[PDB]
Write a protein that binds this ligand. Structure first.
Ligand code: O2Q
Length: 125
């Protein structure tokens, strides 16, 4: 049930950038989603040893979570809003891939995805 190293939250040879949309993704999108009653499974990388999911990283090869996204936004790791939005979408699709329709955690990810899309529908200019 080995855990791989968590996804990087900095990369010295990757260029950094800051935009109004990336500041909004941290201040409004991430920090509001974080407080949702169903955010807690997604606030840190999946710990296969703690959670007893020894096949999690046998299935999920591009893991992602909101704790990683938060640190990436705080580091100015992303070039643009779309790069950050792809990490949220990877986090949701990983949940759907590892589990099955109707599972409690899938119902959680479905509700968070809807709220996420509602908030990114309109971004600052
Ligand atoms: C499965 C699975 N797939 N991705 C993840 C991420 C986190 C995660 N935890 C914390 C355990 C858990 C199990 C069932 C749940 F209903 C739930 F809310 C949470 N489990 N999980």
């Amino acid at each position: 049930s080995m855990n791989p190293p968590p996804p990087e939250t900095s990369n010295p040879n990757k260029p950094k950038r800051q935009t109004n949309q990336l500041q909004y993704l941290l201040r409004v999108v991430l920090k509001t989603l974080w407080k949702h009653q169903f955010a807690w499974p997604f606030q840190q990388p999946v710990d296969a040893v703690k959670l007893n999911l020894p096949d999690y990283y046998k299935i999920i090869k591009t893991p992602m979570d909101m704790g990683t996204i938060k640190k990436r936004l705080e580091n100015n790791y992303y070039w643009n809003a779309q790069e950050c939005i792809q990490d949220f979408n990877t986090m949701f699709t990983n949940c759907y891939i590892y589990n099955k329709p109707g599972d409690d955690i899938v119902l959680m990810a479905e509700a968070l995805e809807k709220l996420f899309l509602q908030k990114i529908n309109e971004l600052p200019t």
